[PDB]
Amino acid sequence: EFIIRIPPYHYIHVLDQNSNVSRVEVGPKTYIRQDNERVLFAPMRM
Amino acid sequence: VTVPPRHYCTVANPVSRDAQGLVLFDVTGQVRLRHADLEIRLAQDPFPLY
Numbered sequence: 001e002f003i004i005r006i007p008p009y010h011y012i013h014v015l016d017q018n019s020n021v022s023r024v025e026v027g028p029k030t031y032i033r034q035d036n037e038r039v040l041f042a043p044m045r046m
Numbered sequence: 047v048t049v050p051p052r053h054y055c056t057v058a059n060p061v062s063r064d065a066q067g068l069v070l071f072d073v074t075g076q077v078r079l080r081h082a083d084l085e086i087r088l089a090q091d092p093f094p095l096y
Contacts (some may be wrong), residue, residue: 028074
């Protein structure tokens with residue numbers, strides 16, 4: 001759950017629960033979430 | 047795959063290439079493509095599918 005590597009040409013949204021702010025991350029990169037931050041859904045193609 | 051003479055094939059998302067036809071690579075090591083495009087390939091050596 002904590003480790004989320006999105007495939008190339010994709011994105012995910014992770015919510016900063018300490019700020020109620022959502023963001024999107026792009027690029028073929030491996031991503032690790034924080035304890036407070038929660039991803040909303042699994043990667044889907046951009 | 048190879049295409050014989052007097053034949054052709056189409057592959058979606060063609061390879062993005064430089065002035066010398068060398069395959070350009072992304073910073074993260076990915077292959078540079080051309081999204082939502084089609085290319086016509088005529089007879090040549092057996093190219094690989096990226």
